[PDB]
Design a protein around this nucleic acid. Structure first.
Lengths: 61, 59, 90, 87
RNA sequence: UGAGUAGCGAAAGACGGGUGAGAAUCCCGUCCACCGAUUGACUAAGGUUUCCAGAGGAAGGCUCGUCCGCUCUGGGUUAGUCGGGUCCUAAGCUGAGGCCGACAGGCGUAGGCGAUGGAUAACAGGUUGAUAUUCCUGUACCACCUAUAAUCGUAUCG
RNA sequence: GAGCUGUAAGUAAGCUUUGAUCCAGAGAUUUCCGAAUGGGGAAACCCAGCAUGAGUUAUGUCAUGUUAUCGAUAUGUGAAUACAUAGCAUAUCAGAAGGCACACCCGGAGAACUGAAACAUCUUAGUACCCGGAGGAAGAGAAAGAAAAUUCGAUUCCCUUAGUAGCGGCGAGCGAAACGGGAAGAGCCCAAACCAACGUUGGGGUUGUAGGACACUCUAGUUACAAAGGACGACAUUAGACGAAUCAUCUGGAAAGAUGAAUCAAAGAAGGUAAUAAUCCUGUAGUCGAAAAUGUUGUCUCUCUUGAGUGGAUCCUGAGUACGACGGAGCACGUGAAAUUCCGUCGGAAUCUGGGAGGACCAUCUCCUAAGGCUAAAUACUCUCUAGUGACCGAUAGUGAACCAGUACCGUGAGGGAAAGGUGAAAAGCACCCCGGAAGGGGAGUGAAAUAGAACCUGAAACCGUGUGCU
C-alpha cells in the first residue's frame, strides 16, 4: 500500500526509466565508492521507484 | 523380448525335478517360427507360434 | 493496550502507588517506560530510567483519579476506549 | 549500460592515473568489447585499449563461521583523450 | 603411577652494535664453515591465497622468541602472436535407424566426443613491495572491413 | 491502529495517523544447472544456425524469439521395379519423458543363514533384495455358486467354527472352508439370429421359473458404473472483534504468601507477571464478522429416454474354445484313490433331446448356464495441514541431531558419524584509584546476594597443595 501516483502515458514511462535508473542510481553509487554521499537512505528510495514504474508498465502489457 | 504376434505366446518358468525330488529352475519356451504373413503395409517377417499357424493363417 | 503519553498508577514493584507519565513503549517485549520510577545507574556514570512490565500499571480515571480497567463500546463508527467502574470516555 | 559497477581507488591505481588508465569493477559475464562501448556512451570519451582480469573467492572467517567472498572481475581502460574526472 | 624419567628427527659457529619490559635463538656488519651432474636456475602434475606491506604474542613452532608458511587490517595475477577452445584425428567412450534379450538392459552402422601426436602470426631493453613474449619504449608479423587507383571483363573463385 | 527497517548487537542515514511495520485472499518479475531438449561437456560451463532489431563510414559486438528424440494426424512423396510400397522434407499436438512418503496395493523374477539337536524330501519362504504398472485407495465382484432345508441368492471386511477336518522322510512342522452372528449394500452394457444403404455405419437384442429374433389386437435427465459439455443459493475453510468480578496490614529487593473484609461465574482450562493469583496482562465460556479464492450441498434449468403377457414352424446364444496325454505350478492338501484351475508341446468335441458341477469314476436326482467388458460402500497406510491427550523422557535420557547436525571429522568411492543447554527480575556487564608491556589481582561502585563477573544456578568423588593436636 504505497503512493501509486504514476498514471501518465506509456510513452513517458520509458522516459522515466533512463532518468530514475540510468543517471540517478548509477551516479549515487560512484559517489559512495570514493565516499562523498550523505543521505544514504536515498539509495533505497530510487530503487523502489523503478520497481513501481515497471509494475504499472506490465499491467498495460 | 520375443512373443507371438497373433496370439501372444511367451515363455514361462518352473521347476526341474529329479528322482530324489531336488528342484532347479528352468523355462518352457514357445514354439515360435519366423514366418512372413500378410500386413497392411510391407509384408514383414514376424514371430508366430506353430499353434497360431493352425486353423488357417496367411503366409 | 497502554498507549504512550498516558497517566498510569503503579500497583506492583519498588515504586508502587506512584503516578507517572508513559514516555516510551516496547511492545515486542511488552515493556512500558514510566517517568520518575525504576531509576538505574550505568557505569559509562549516569542516572536514567528503566523499563517496567505493562501488567504492573493501570490507567487513571479522568474524574476520580483512581485505577480502573478499560473497555470499548463503539460510540461512533470508529472504536473508542472507556473505563470500567464508570462511563467516562478516556 | 550499467556494465560498470564501481571505481577502484588503490595505491597501484593512483600511479596508473598518470598514464590515463582507470580501474573499474565490471559485471562477471561481460567481455572487454562490451566494456569498451560502455565508457564511450557514459563519459563521452574515446578509448584506446581495454585490459581485464579475473579473481577467485577468498576464504574469510569472522567470529566462528567460515565463508567465501564474491568473485571479482576487474578492468583497466586506457584513454587517449579527455578525462573521466573521478571525485 | 612410571617421573621431573626416555626423547627433543643426519650437520659449525664466533664476536660487535641496535630493538626491547624481558635476547645464545630477532635485525645490521666482519670472520670462519658446507653443496656446487647441485642444498643453484626454470617448469608439468598436485595444493589453493600459504605471495606483499603495516601492526600483535593467548594458542601452533618438540627450547626461547621482539620472529614466522601463525593472528588483525589493507593490497597483489593485465595477451590478436605464449599453453588450450572458435582446426585435425590415435587407443578408448557414446551411438539416429537396426540386431538380441523375463524386466532392468547388451552389442553395433552412419555420425560424434576424445592428446600424451599433427597444423598454426614477435623480438630486444626498462620498470614495482608484490605482474611481465601480458605494462612501457623501439622495431615487426598474420587474418578481416571500408573509398579512388595501376592492370582488367575468359579474367577470378571452386 | 503506532511505531518500524529479522536473528544482531552497535553506529549512521531514514519511513509513519495523508494509516509505517505486521495478518489473510488475489496478481506481476523470477539469473544459471538439473528429464535439460540447438551441438558439446569433467552439472551450475563452452561453442552455433535461422528471423527481426539496437550501435559502427564497414567488419568486429549485443538484445529478443526459435532449432532435441519418439509417437499420433493431414499434404508432396522417382527407388532397386510398370502402378506401388521402404527411405525422405514440412505443418500441428497442456501426447510421452523425470521425481516423489524407502507407508498401503497388483504383477515379473526370486535366495541364504536357521529348524529338523547331522542331512538331501520338508522348513525358513513365496520372506529379504531387484524390476514394472498405477490409485487415493488398489485387488475381487452380478453363480457353468454354496448345499441336501416344507433352502439361500454379486463382491469385500470383523467374530466364531478351530488349532477341528486334513496334509506330512505321517518326522520337524503346515493348516482350511460351508453354516451362524455383524459393518456395508444399486446393477447394467456388448457378439449372433432380423431389418435398408454402400464388408462399414445406425435400429433390435442380453437369458435358466429358458431368453430372444419372427409372427401376434398391444404405453424415471440418475455425469460414482448404467451416454456425454454447461447455467440456478445455503453451509465450511484461508485474516479477526466484543467479552464479569479486589482492596487493606506483616516479612521481604520484589507479594500472587499469611492475617481481614468483598465480587463474579454458560468464564475455577492454560501461560506470563521481581515469590504460590477465579477478580494485573494475554486468554477461556458465549456471540458476532468475509472484499476475494477454494470445497460440499439442494430448488429450478439443460442433455437422453418404447412401457407390458399367451404361441415356440424355422433360426441364433462367444472354437483351435472346453477336454485328453506328457512335463510343471497353484489350491491348507508333498501326484497320492486328487475332484476343482493356470502355463508350455501335441491331438481335439456338441449345439437346448445342448453343456457344466455336487472331492477318482458310472447311473439316477438337484443346482447352474464357461470360453466378451465396466461398477461406489464397509477395508489398509501416513511425508504433510488444524485442533488435542498421556500413572511417556528431562541433556550419558528423549529422534543421530533441545546448540545453523547429516554439520565436524574419517575414506578414491559406495559409505560411516560426533561432543557442546542454564548470570540476574531487570545489562543495571564493574565510572574511578594502585602493581604491567599485557593477562591477572586489591579497593571503590551496581545489585538481595559478585566464591551470581559472561571458562558465570547448586557444586560429590578420584587427585593436587598450606598450617596445625598426638606419634
Amino acid at each position: 500500500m504505497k503512493a501509486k501516483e504514476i498514471r501518465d502515458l506509456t510513452t513517458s514511462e520509458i522516459e522515466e526509466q533512463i532518468k530514475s535508473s540510468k543517471e540517478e542510481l548509477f551516479n549515487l553509487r560512484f559517489q559512495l565508492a570514493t565516499g562523498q554521499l550523505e543521505e544514504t537512505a536515498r539509495i533505497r528510495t530510487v530503487r523502489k521507484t523503478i520497481a513501481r514504474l515497471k509494475t504499472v508498465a506490465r499491467e498495460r502489457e | 523380448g520375443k512373443q507371438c504376434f497373433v496370439t501372444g505366446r511367451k515363455a514361462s518358468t518352473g521347476n526341474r525335478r529329479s528322482h530324489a525330488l531336488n528342484s532347479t529352475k528352468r523355462r518352457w519356451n514357445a514354439n515360435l517360427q519366423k514366418v512372413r504373413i500378410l500386413v497392411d503395409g510391407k509384408p514383414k517377417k514376424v514371430w508366430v507360434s506353430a499353434r497360431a499357424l493352425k486353423s488357417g493363417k496367411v503366409t | 493496550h497502554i498507549k504512550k503519553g498516558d497517566n498510569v498508577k503503579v500497583i506492583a514493584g519498588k515504586d508502587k502507588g506512584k503516578e507517572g507519565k508513559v514516555i516510551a513503549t516496547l511492545p515486542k517485549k511488552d515493556r512500558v517506560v514510566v517517568e520518575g520510577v525504576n531509576i538505574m545507574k550505568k557505569h559509562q556514570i549516569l542516572e536514567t530510567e528503566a523499563a517496567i512490565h505493562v501488567s504492573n500499571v493501570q490507567l487513571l480515571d479522568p474524574k476520580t483519579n483512581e485505577p480502573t480497567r478499560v473497555g470499548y463500546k463503539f460510540v461512533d463508527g470508529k472504536k473508542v476506549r472507556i473505563a470500567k467502574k464508570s462511563g467516562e470516555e478516556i | 549500460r550499467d556494465i560498470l559497477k564501481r571505481p577502484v581507488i588503490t595505491e597501484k591505481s593512483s600511479e596508473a592515473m598518470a598514464e590515463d588508465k582507470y580501474t573499474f569493477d565490471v559485471d562477471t559475464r561481460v567481455n572487454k568489447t562490451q566494456v569498451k562501448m560502455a565508457v564511450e556512451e557514459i563519459f563521452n570519451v574515446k578509448v584506446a585499449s581495454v585490459n581485464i582480469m579475473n579473481y577467485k573467492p577468498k576464504k574469510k572467517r569472522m567470529g566462528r563461521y567460515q565463508g567465501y567472498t564474491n568473485k571479482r572481475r576487474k578492468a583497466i581502460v586506457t584513454l587517449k583523450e579527455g578525462s573521466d574526472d573521478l571525485f
